[model samples]
Target: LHRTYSQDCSFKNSMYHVGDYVYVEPAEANLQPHIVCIERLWEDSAGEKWLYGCWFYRPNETFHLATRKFLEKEVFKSDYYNKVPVSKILGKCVVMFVKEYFKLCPENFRDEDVFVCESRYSAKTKSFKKIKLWTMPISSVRFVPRDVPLPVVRVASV
Candidate 1:
């Protein structure tokens, strides 16, 4: 799966455009979980905007259904945990839906743009110092709105 997707995966530091279909990491939601896609691109006072969104993958063609109910579901609008990106949706996920996959390849991308990929390296061990391969993006992804206070759970309120 990685190999197949890797072919289209954006090389490290490669920039992607608006309509470009790209691969992304997957995430699970609490309810009405369906195939999701996300794309967040905005420029601040700083400089160029470079970021990717997380894509959701599920079985069956429940994307439309999940998306429909998910939109209506208050938790989604008010209290949610994940949001798909436009780019990731274009690429699709491992679960897949229909035989058609994402397009947009290593061609049109800029050097700074990246094709997000999972890391295979681990911590260093005794004999040999683990060589750090700072290629892939670090494992730090999420879609919950920027500012949503964490839900509080109390077991002692009797």
Candidate 2:
């Protein structure tokens, strides 16, 4: 089991960072790929590249409440992790926070970009956080929209 880990790797001439959220091809019968945030990378005895990371769940993958409607771009990242082949890595997926998805904006990413996480979901308790829906600080920074909103005068003219 002589395997070594690396900080980063390049596939198809594109460099992928350790903490990047990437899409990985799933088994047949599914139209979508699995979203994973890579944390580990290595080459095994067989010379195959592998990675391990936490998974981001699609809106339908977890428990849902009838009272709520999930945004098409919403997802839940869990503490659960898995080992997968680097060959299956597809493309990058930008998972962001709730506020920045609109308030700060990522300069309106392409169609492929959408998912905004509400909180760290736990499958064990089938919940996302303690309550109040307060978001956590992201380890990375995203682009902020340059323009600011315009303001108008009040009707009272005070």
Candidate 3:
């Protein structure tokens, strides 16, 4: 599924869950231009428990779980993908600071726990080039749970 930048889907009637892999039109404040978040929905508490995390994509295309696997195997170019610990993939972040952002967000928004807006990145080119370009919505989020049963799907596809 594709994403729309200016659209905000209704969480009030969604069947998607906290760990479901979804195609969401994320907030445009901290993301790269022409990029939309196609990520796992992680944290959702009481009142709003549907919205979650984002995967930050450069394009809104038909991306299957296999595509991600292909990238991890052929393109990622990092040994960490296969051998590195999962902890490295999920780095640490300050919760209080993010909570501050949540508080600052418009009160009209419903779920604060699903807020994935990050403030800084590894580097910035808005001021300099080749230094480092990094941005994220939130911190400490994990991979979305597999949508369909992998084993069953694998057998069926074969």
Candidate 4:
């Protein structure tokens, strides 16, 4: 099962993996970073790696940073948009998802523009839920830089 997803697990220490917690550094120093739980890892034929997981988003803070057009076109089009402090879990994303999103951007939009992915869970239900896909930036992902502990082996010589 592991081989199906990973090409090689030879690396003794990897920074990120399934079930690990990761954080994206906020664009501005004053803003808080976005935290997520990695649930999947994907590798395309070209050997590029991508991580997909459940994101914890701050809607109010996030919407404030979004442009009027993006908010109207992308966000408001969906039924989920509202003014509240909600924790959203986005999922199972691939490279194409990011590329497709950025392809339609206007000139004034920055690469750091915050967006959303499909929500796969509801905190209230505790069951799987499928929500609309929102736009998010690929460049915004910054692995929070952690050390994965590897087992130490002792070698004895005669």
Candidate 5:
């Protein structure tokens, strides 16, 4: 039995959804892990898992800027989309737009792999622009599993 266009999929201790950011195996040997945001996931009727997602450009890969200094975890958004098998997914990471990068990402969240995306780039046009919030992938699904604690309520009578 097989399913088609599944809403979510979990493998190797990770749960993935349409809007999750992930690290993927690079096409070339020397290249670093590819970063992608899952846009679609489905299991073929015969059982092969497929994924389509938006790709974020590594700081090193965007060369339009003559000279730029960036944060260790900074990356750029692009219009590029990639379709790859879900088996290639390696790890999950955080991708926050620069507007909230400093405040929201640092204090509360725990993953050290967070990346700040400040602008959008187009390799075809070779230009950059401020990021638009609406264009980013949106999902209400959880990316990983964690423990939940039960709440205990004590009634104090005066």
Candidate 6:
């Protein structure tokens, strides 16, 4: 069984917490991007760090749960399969602080606020593309219990 972390479980500069939204890099480059929700965190019997989450999908793709093993590899892998290392930290996804890109983004945006647009990385430039909004409607929000089991499907990559 997975033992969840206490609210006080934080290390130097670790800002992630249960229930916060985040973007996780997929193991495959061709996979669509999704925002993952921080659910539970714990060190395994071997003392390796790990976390489990639920991924929020684009309007075209339904949201789903990712396996614990999948998340561990994506976060710890040090090879080409790892897309972005910094993204593993909480509150550091495409929904980043405005100060990091104030010169490019609107001057009115604040550092404490998060970017609401969908953003992706460019392999050619080794940078992220310009942030853009969702032109279509997204699925309505619902209350899913933290322990609710999602059906196993082939959508773990998102």
Which candidate leads the pack in TM-score? 5
Tens-digit lDDT track for model 4 on 58-98?
33323332331222112111222221111222221222122
Candidate 3 residue-wise lDDT, 40-86, digit = tens: 33222332322324333221222223333211101110111011111
How many clashing pairs in candidate 2? 0
Please, what is the TM-score per model?
Answer: 0.22, 0.74, 0.20, 0.29, 0.77, 0.36
By TM-score, rank the candidates, best first: 5, 2, 6, 4, 1, 3
lDDT of 1 by residue, 1-158 (tens): 11111112232355444333344534554343332222344443443333344332222222222222211111111111243333333232221111111222233233233222211111122111112332222222212221332232212111
Q: Write the per-residue lDDT of candidate 2 for residues 1-158, one digit (tens) a residue.
A: 68889877776676766776789998977667989888888887998888898898886666656555565577787878899988898877677666555545454356456576766778887776522453332334366663662122212111
- Worst 10-residue lDDT window for candidate 6 reads 71-80
The 0-to-1 C-alpha lDDT of every candidate, in the order given, reads 0.27, 0.69, 0.25, 0.35, 0.72, 0.37
| Candidate 6 residue runs with Cα over 4 Å from true position | 1-4, 8-12, 63-158
Among all windows of 10 consecutive residues in model 2, the one with the lowest summed lDDT is 149-158
Q: Is candidate 2 or candidate 4 better by lDDT?
A: 2
Please give, for residues 46-150, the per-residue lDDT of candidate 6 as tens digits: 544555554443423422234311211121111122212333543433232222232232233233332333343333343333334432222122222323322
Q: By lDDT, who's the top model here?
A: 5
lDDT of 6: 0.37
Comparing candidate 3 with candidate 4, which one achieves the higher lDDT?
A: 4
- Candidate 2 overall Cα lDDT vs. reference? 0.69
Candidate 5: segments with Cα more than 4 A from true spot = 1-3, 106-111, 140-158
